[PDB]
Design a protein around this ligand. Sequence first.
Ligand code: IUM
Ligand code: IUM
Lengths: 81, 80
Amino acid sequence: NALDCRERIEKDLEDLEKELMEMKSIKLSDDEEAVVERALNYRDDSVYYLEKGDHITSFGCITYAEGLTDSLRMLHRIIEG
Amino acid sequence: ALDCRERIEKDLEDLEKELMEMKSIKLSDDEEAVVERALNYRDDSVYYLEKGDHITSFGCITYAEGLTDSLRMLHRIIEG
Ligand code: IUM
Ligand code: IUM
């Protein structure tokens, strides 16, 4: 499956990075900041497994991180302020 | 591997329990959207597993786990 090929994972990582920076652009609670930190840990893990050639684990890590991050984004409508 | 049938089946059973429990506490409207999305992605995982698309199923379940775990991290029993 092309979902876990190198180029797709790389682009997933780039997109996650932008999303994390986006969430860092607003005030988050300490608990939400802990979610961000966990997402960053899983980003780092995704990169590790990609670099070791384990695309399935890498893909799992990035999608988990995307879930963590997308939840935060959904809890903060951009028109919330 | 993390995406073998046995592992995905266990992931799906575990997530169902987590979601049923999250489903039945007081949630904000925004959190309800997240729970709905997690349930939808669990259903997608179930579907792709039936089709034998293990990578796709695995992506769906891990995404749903991330959505769900984020909520769990915002609802610590002992907040501190
Ligand atoms: O396959 U490249 O950066
Ligand atoms: O999806 U959970 O621990």
